[PDB]
């Protein structure tokens, strides 16, 4: 196909030699889902600005307002290094010698009487 | 400025390749960081056409080991594409370290302090550190051995901190440095039968090559993603892609749960049998399946007292499974992201888990929150390994660096760079002096820990080296990779020699350090284990492929 | 409202009956708050019906979150053991308590062995020399400490002779549980920091 | 307790989806088969969702019975707030 | 500077349950969530208003961001 | 499909759509019922063998050559 032969070149440019045949079919299904939610929001933004033609600033708005919600990322390095030094300053606690099975408080564990219904 | 970046970079490319060959191989190190820092500054200032032209003109003169980063960069053409990458965002703000000699830096600074090239000199002194050592300029096959990371080849001032790399009972830490747990009478009973196994332990060396017992997972149509074996070869755990952990007993002794609370209330304590009395014989299988992860289990770690299985998965939780009740006890939710590895401490109280959120957390099985956050990596923390004294945590990662972290203060005390792919295996020497790391380039790099210097490079494997272990004596390092081979390396002849130049001349001796290579039948060697009588165990799902 | 058979309509209508079965932001500091973010875009003045519309929008954001954390803060206040339609299946907490009791018994046996060794070292007359003198000292120090506690009790005794509606509470877990489920604030820096608070 | 009564009746009831298949997708998400009746209630809830979508789609087909087309699933899931996608790339 | 006065938030809980008490940590996180909501909504609404070539920030702009990204549908 | 509310399925994978390029794009609804279901394969088991006996690889069928 046309758009499915370009999908095998996006993977081969990323060095993906081996892949399942259903991999191309659902990256096209995601790419179709992504462009019919940019352009669906683009004509919502065009009707907000009251213009009959969806021009390039509408797609510039609908991309950056969908990428502000959908595609997130891990926390940044200046945020990870601040919560590290706030946590790594606290000294390590000592251990009670014969406390038993060392566990968190019981509202943080998964150890409850764990009931079930009576069969009748 | 931006339209003449192909004139600044090509001028410095013309100066370096016209230099003499002793300084040319060392001055070729600043091709890659000046190519990326000029390309990422073009796309951050919204100069896409010029960025694309720079990438096309200079991407192919970059070293072959950098193809993956180069492909991620070829995708990055917009500013907002890079504003949510968080690896090139941390590459743009950090400084490339670029260890160069003073004999080659004098030729570089005599070509940059002049006004003819004051723009590429302005990019160098803004985006690049330069760490100068007084010595010989390194060869090209020695520079190739120690570069490969992003913001790589770190300073010698990082690798000069005092590391207590010795074992517990002038390099050993005190016993009260890290508050380690007590040694109980059941834990002291374990070491009594452990030294009976040490009596039958064979000296391996280069002559008495060990026997390898492969524990293959035959059907495994849910993909096996994690294996662990206990310290005595008694249990084998399997983490699978169908969100299950499966414990197998390998000794002829079925897996039993302890009795319920009604049955324990009628028996008495203080009896000699006690543990035997508590076991339930109604529940006795050769296989126990553990449910509760909502995602593929990627880490698996036993505790040294043979209770307390650990497992981490894609759903962002680390789970502590009991091996006396065979239920889940705690779910440690600190990552929102796939936790790629976990490991218990060799004393069994603390555990470290590294995830996709580019940190490694230190937990203690007593707090719902971590104690130490090791947050200096720029990509995913793929591996997390404890030191044999458990005062130090080694975290390999996907930004091609291995970092040692002190458990006190959470400080990075060593940075080991020189891998070309993401590190997928770490192991420590039983001395505590050395550290073997493996990655996707098929290279096993042997690092010193006191000197912070790589001491050897083992380059026999072809695909990703996913499992390493030293022997119980330290005589042999066993390596297992995706080429379905278990290679054995001489881990005594590799450490026969024990600076201020911050590097040693690596020997190119891999051929003499290979004692043997054994090929698996279509089976990637996921785990490698050494029995206390020095017998190699290996586990891998058989994939016909 | 755009969907007549919408699926979040049936959620918060059945959630309220599950909680039945057991903001109005300040207009003066908010109007300064909208205008300062408007300097970064060129939105120099705002419509007079907006600062009360954002206050109605912030209310329906938190009331959709207060109702969501209330139906999981009452999820923990359902005691099964009062009902006898349910049967207990696995009490692992009791088994852990029994393991703790076994550890305590091991500690008591170690203490008894130490006491037997102390009884053996009592007869110290240059026989075992220091291995016996140290133990005598330690026993003397233990006796001293027990004696300080006993005298603190005796002085208290002498002075005594001279004298003679279940409130459901929402934890941070219930708020965190209602953040990783919704699509917003699932991968966010406010939930990631909340794992350490 | 109407639903507690229903779940107690769910023993001796065989649902349209097998419990070896409903229990497989529950084990994939950590839900383990402690009680068969609970697996059966989950199976019946999934069945009701698919059946309600199908019946709405049939009312749309009768308005425009017989063949179910993507242009019948499109207005049927639109009141549910679900925008179904055509393939369009094969 | 604080827009939510920590007492009207307690009336948002009393309307749902007359017998419920939040924790101080929960209240502070709820206040942070409110502050973050106000900021994100206003920034995107202002992006829509610049798009409509306006300096006025009318509700149409605030109402559109709720319906498309948050699905709130507050009556205007 | 894409659910705006996101509450019926929250980040839950439905395993994709088994669709082809050379497909028929219309089937009979009793053809899918009357076909036999595929066999569920064997569960995962742990078998042990020998890669190396004191340095030499044995020629057992669990070994390649």
UniProtKB/Swiss-Prot annotation, chain A:
Entry superkingdom: Eukaryota
Quote the subcellular location field of this record: Nucleus
Give the DNA-binding residue ranges. Answer: 108-120
Induction statement: 6 to 8-fold by apoptotic signals.
Q: How does it assemble?
A: Component of the TFIID basal transcription factor complex, composed of TATA-box-binding protein TBP, and a number of TBP-associated factors (TAFs), including TAF1, TAF2, TAF3, TAF4, TAF5, TAF6, TAF7, TAF8, TAF9, TAF10, TAF11, TAF12 and TAF13. Component of the TATA-binding protein-free TAF complex (TFTC), the PCAF histone acetylase complex and the STAGA transcription coactivator-HAT complex. The PCAF complex consists at least of TADA2L/ADA2, SUPT3H/SPT3, TADA3L/ADA3, TAF5L/PAF65-beta, TAF6L/PAF65-alpha, TAF10/TAFII30, TAF12/TAFII20, TAF9/TAFII31 and TRRAP.
Q: What does this protein do?
A: The TFIID basal transcription factor complex plays a major role in the initiation of RNA polymerase II (Pol II)-dependent transcription. TFIID recognizes and binds promoters with or without a TATA box via its subunit TBP, a TATA-box-binding protein, and promotes assembly of the pre-initiation complex (PIC). The TFIID complex consists of TBP and TBP-associated factors (TAFs), including TAF1, TAF2, TAF3, TAF4, TAF5, TAF6, TAF7, TAF8, TAF9, TAF10, TAF11, TAF12 and TAF13.
Family statement: Belongs to the TAF9 family.
Instruction: List the protein's name.
Output: Transcription initiation factor TFIID subunit 9
Span covered, complete protein: 13 to 132 of 264
UniProtKB/Swiss-Prot annotation, chain D:
One GO biological process term is: regulation of DNA-templated transcription
Post-translational modification as stated in the protein's UniProt record: Allysine formation by LOXL2 results in release of TAF10 from promoters, leading to inhibition of TFIID-dependent transcription.
Q: Where in the cell is it found?
A: Nucleus
Which UniProt keywords are listed?
A: Acetylation, Methylation, Nucleus, Phosphoprotein, Transcription, Transcription regulation
Show which residues constitute the signal peptide: none
Classify the main location.
Answer: nucleus
Coiled-coil intervals in this record?
A: none
> Which cellular component terms (GO) are annotated to the entry?
cytoplasm; male germ cell nucleus; nucleoplasm; nucleus; perinuclear region of cytoplasm; SAGA complex; transcription factor TFIID complex; transcription factor TFTC complex
Keyword Nucleus listed? The answer is yes
Record has Lipid biosynthesis as a keyword: no
The domain section of the record reads: The [KR]-[STA]-K motif is specifically recognized by the SETD7 methyltransferase.
What quaternary arrangement does the UniProt entry report?
Component of the TFIID basal transcription factor complex, composed of TATA-box-binding protein TBP, and a number of TBP-associated factors (TAFs), including TAF1, TAF2, TAF3, TAF4, TAF5, TAF6, TAF7, TAF8, TAF9, TAF10, TAF11, TAF12 and TAF13. Component of the TATA-binding protein-free TAF complex (TFTC), the PCAF histone acetylase complex and the STAGA transcription coactivator-HAT complex. The PCAF complex consists at least of TADA2L/ADA2, TADA3L/ADA3, SUPT3H, TAF5L TAF6L, TAF9, TAF10, TAF12 and TRRAP.
Q: Which family does it belong to?
A: Belongs to the TAF10 family.
Which protein, by its recorded name, is this?
Transcription initiation factor TFIID subunit 10
Q: What is the source species?
A: Homo sapiens
Parent-record interval covered: 114 to 217 of 218
Swiss-Prot record, chain E:
The Histone-fold domain covers 5-72
Per UniProt, subcellular location reads as: Nucleus
Instruction: List modified residues, type Phosphothreonine.
Output: 5
Tissue-specificity statement: Ubiquitous.
Q: What does this protein do?
A: The TFIID basal transcription factor complex plays a major role in the initiation of RNA polymerase II (Pol II)-dependent transcription. TFIID recognizes and binds promoters with or without a TATA box via its subunit TBP, a TATA-box-binding protein, and promotes assembly of the pre-initiation complex (PIC). The TFIID complex consists of TBP and TBP-associated factors (TAFs), including TAF1, TAF2, TAF3, TAF4, TAF5, TAF6, TAF7, TAF8, TAF9, TAF10, TAF11, TAF12 and TAF13.
Q: Which family does it belong to?
A: Belongs to the TAF12 family.
Q: How does it assemble?
A: Component of the TFIID basal transcription factor complex, composed of TATA-box-binding protein TBP, and a number of TBP-associated factors (TAFs), including TAF1, TAF2, TAF3, TAF4, TAF5, TAF6, TAF7, TAF8, TAF9, TAF10, TAF11, TAF12 and TAF13. Component of the TATA-binding protein-free TAF complex (TFTC), the PCAF histone acetylase complex and the STAGA transcription coactivator-HAT complex. Component of the PCAF complex, at least composed of TADA2L/ADA2, TADA3L/ADA3, TAF5L/PAF65-beta, SUPT3H, TAF6L, TAF9, TAF10, TAF12 and TRRAP.
Question: Under what name is this protein listed?
Answer: Transcription initiation factor TFIID subunit 12
Organism equals: Homo sapiens
What gene does the UniProt entry assign to this protein?
TAF12
UniProtKB/Swiss-Prot annotation, chain F:
Its subcellular locations are: Nucleus
Q: Which residues carry this modification: Phosphothreonine?
A: 35
Domain of life of the native organism: Eukaryota
Tell me which family the UniProt entry assigns to this protein.
Belongs to the TAF6 family.
State which disorder the record connects to this protein. Answer: Alazami-Yuan syndrome: An autosomal recessive syndrome reminiscent of Cornelia de Lange syndrome and characterized by delayed psychomotor development with intellectual disability, hypotonia, microcephaly, short stature, poor speech, and dysmorphic features.
Oligomer and partners: Component of the TFIID basal transcription factor complex, composed of TATA-box-binding protein TBP, and a number of TBP-associated factors (TAFs), including TAF1, TAF2, TAF3, TAF4, TAF5, TAF6, TAF7, TAF8, TAF9, TAF10, TAF11, TAF12 and TAF13. Interacts directly with TBP, TAF1/TAFII250, TAF9/TAFII31 and TAF12/TAFII20. The TAF6/TAFII70-TAF9/TAFII31 heterodimer forms an octamer complex with the TAF4B/TFII105-TAF12/TFIID20 heterodimer.
List the protein's name.
Answer: Transcription initiation factor TFIID subunit 6
**Which source organism does the UniProt entry give?**
Homo sapiens
Residue range from the parent sequence: 86 to 150 of 677
């Amino acid at each position: 196909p046309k758009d499915a032969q370009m999908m095998a070149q996006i993977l081969k440019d990323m060095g993906i030699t081996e892949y399942e045949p259903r991999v191309i079919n659902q990256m096209l299904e995601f790419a179709f889902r992504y462009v019919t939610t940019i352009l669906d929001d683009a004509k919502i933004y065009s009707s907000h600005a009251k213009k009959a033609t969806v021009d390039a600033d509408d797609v510039r708005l609908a991309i950056q307002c969908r990428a502000d919600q959908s595609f997130t990322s891990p926390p940044p390095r200046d945020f990870l290094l601040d919560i590290a030094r706030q946590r790594n300053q606290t000294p390590l606690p000592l251990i009670k010698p014969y406390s038993g099975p060392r566990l968190p408080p019981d509202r943080y564990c998964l150890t409850a009487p764990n009931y079930r219904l009576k069969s009748l | 400025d931006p339209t003449m970046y192909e004139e600044y970079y090509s001028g410095l490319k013309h100066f370096i390749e016209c230099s003499l060959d002793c300084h040319r191989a060392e001055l070729s190190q600043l091709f890659y960081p000046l190519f990326v820092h000029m390309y990422l500054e073009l796309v951050y200032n919204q100069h896409e056409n010029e960025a694309k032209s720079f990438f096309e003109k200079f991407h192919g003169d970059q070293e072959c080991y950098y193809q993956d980063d180069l492909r991620v960069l070829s995708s990055l053409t917009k500013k907002e594409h890079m504003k949510g990458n968080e690896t090139m965002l941390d590459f743009r703000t950090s400084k490339f370290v670029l260890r160069i000699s003073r004999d080659s830096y004098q030729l570089l600074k005599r070509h940059l302090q002049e006004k003819q090239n004051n723009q590429i000199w302005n990019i160098v002194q803004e985006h690049l550190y330069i760490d100068i050592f007084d010595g010989m300029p390194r060869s090209k096959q020695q520079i190739d051995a120690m570069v490969g990371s992003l913001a790589g080849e770190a300073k010698r001032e990082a690798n000069k901190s005092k590391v207590f790399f010795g074992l517990l009972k002038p390099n050993a830490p005190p016993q009260n440095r890290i508050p380690l747990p007590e040694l109980k009478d059941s834990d002291k009973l374990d070491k009594i039968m452990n030294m009976k196994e040490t009596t039958k332990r064979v000296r391996l060396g280069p002559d008495c090559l060990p026997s390898i017992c492969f524990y293959t997972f035959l059907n495994a149509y849910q993909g096996l993603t994690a294996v662990d074996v206990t310290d005595d070869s008694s249990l084998i755990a399997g983490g699978f892609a169908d969100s299950t952990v499966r414990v197998w007993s390998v000794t002829p002794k079925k897996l039993r749960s302890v009795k319920q609370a009604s049955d324990l209330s009628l028996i008495d304590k203080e009896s000699d049998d006690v543990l035997e009395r508590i076991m339930d014989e109604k529940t006795a299988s050769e296989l126990k399946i553990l449910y509760g992860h909502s995602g593929p289990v990627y880490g698996a770690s036993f505790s040294p007292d043979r209770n307390y299985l650990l497992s981490s998965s894609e759903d962002g939780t680390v789970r502590l499974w009991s091996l006396q009740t065979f239920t889940c006890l705690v779910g440690y939710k600190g990552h929102n992201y796939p936790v790629w590895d976990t490991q218990f401490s060799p004393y069994g109280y603390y555990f470290v888990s590294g995830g996709h959120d580019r940190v490694a957390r230190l937990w203690a099985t007593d707090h719902y929150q971590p104690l130490r956050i090791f947050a200096g990596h720029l990509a995913d923390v793929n591996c997390t390994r404890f030191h044999p004294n458990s005062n130090y945590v080694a975290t390999g990662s996907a930004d091609r660096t291995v970092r040692l972290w002190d458990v006190l203060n959470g400080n990075c005390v060593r940075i080991f760079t020189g891998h070309k792919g993401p590190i997928h295996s770490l192991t420590f020497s039983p001395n505590g002096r050395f550290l073997a790391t493996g990655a996707t380039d098929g290279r096993v790099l042997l690092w010193d820990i006191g000197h912070g210097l790589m001491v050897g490079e083992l380059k026999g494997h072809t695909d990703t080296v996913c499992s390493l272990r030293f022997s119980r004596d330290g005589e042999i390092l066993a390596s297992g990779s995706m080429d379905n081979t278990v290679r054995l390396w001489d881990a005594i002849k590799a450490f026969e020699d024990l600076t201020a130049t911050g590097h040693i001349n690596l020997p190119e001796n891999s051929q003499e350090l290979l004692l043997g290579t054994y090929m698996t039948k279509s089976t990637p060697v996921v785990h490698l284990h050494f029995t206390r009588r020095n017998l190699v165990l290996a586990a891998g799902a058989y994939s016909p492929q | 409202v755009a969907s007549m058979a919408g699926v979040n309509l049936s959620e918060e209508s059945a959630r309220i009956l599950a909680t039945n079965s057991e903001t109005f932001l300040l207009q003066a500091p908010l109007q300064r708050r909208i205008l300062e973010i408007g300097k970064k875009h060129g939105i120099t003045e705002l419509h007079p019906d907006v600062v009360s519309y954002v206050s109605h929008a912030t209310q329906q954001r938190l009331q959709n979150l207060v109702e969501k954390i209330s139906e999981t803060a009452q999820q923990k206040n359902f005691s099964y053991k009062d009902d006898d339609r349910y049967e207990q299946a696995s009490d692992v907490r009791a088994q852990l308590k029994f393991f703790e009791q076994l550890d305590q018994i091991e500690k008591q046996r170690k203490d008894e062995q130490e006491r037997e060794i102390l009884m053996r070292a009592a007869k110290s007359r240059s026989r075992q020399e220091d291995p016996e003198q140290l133990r005598l000292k330690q026993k003397a120090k233990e006796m001293q400490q027990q004696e300080l506690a006993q005298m603190r009790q005796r002085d208290a005794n002498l002075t005594a002779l001279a004298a003679i509606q279940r409130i459901t509470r929402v934890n941070l877990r219930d708020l965190i549980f209602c953040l990783e489920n919704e699509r917003e604030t699932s991968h966010s820096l406010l939930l990631y920091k909340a794992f350490l608070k | 307790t109407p639903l507690v009564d229903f779940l107690m009746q769910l023993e001796d009831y065989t649902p349209t989806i097998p419990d070896a298949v409903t229990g497989y997708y529950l084990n994939r998400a950590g839900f383990e088969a402690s009680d068969p009746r609970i697996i059966r209630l989950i199976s019946l809830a999934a069945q009701k969702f698919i059946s309600d979508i199908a019946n709405d789609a049939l009312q749309h087909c009768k308005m425009k019975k017989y063949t179910l087309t993507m242009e019948d699933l499109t207005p049927a899931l639109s009141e549910y707030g679900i925008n179904v996608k055509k393939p369009h790339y094969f | 500077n604080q827009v939510l006065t920590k007492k009207k938030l307690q009336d948002l809980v009393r309307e749902v349950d007359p017998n419920e008490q939040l924790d101080e940590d929960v209240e502070e996180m709820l206040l942070q969530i409110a502050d973050d909501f106000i900021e994100s909504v206003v920034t995107a609404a202002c992006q829509l208003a610049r798009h409509r070539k306006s300096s006025t920030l009318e509700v149409k702009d605030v109402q559109l961001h709720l319906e498309r990204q948050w699905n709130m549908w507050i009556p205007g | 499909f894409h659910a705006q509310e996101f509450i019926p399925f929250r980040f839950a994978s439905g395993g994709g759509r088994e669709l082809y390029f050379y497909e028929e794009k219309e089937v009979d609804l009793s053809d899918i019922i009357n076909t036999p279901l595929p066999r569920v394969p064997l569960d995962v088991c742990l078998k042990a063998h020998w890669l190396s006996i004191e340095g030499c690889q044995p020629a057992i069928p669990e070994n390649p050559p």
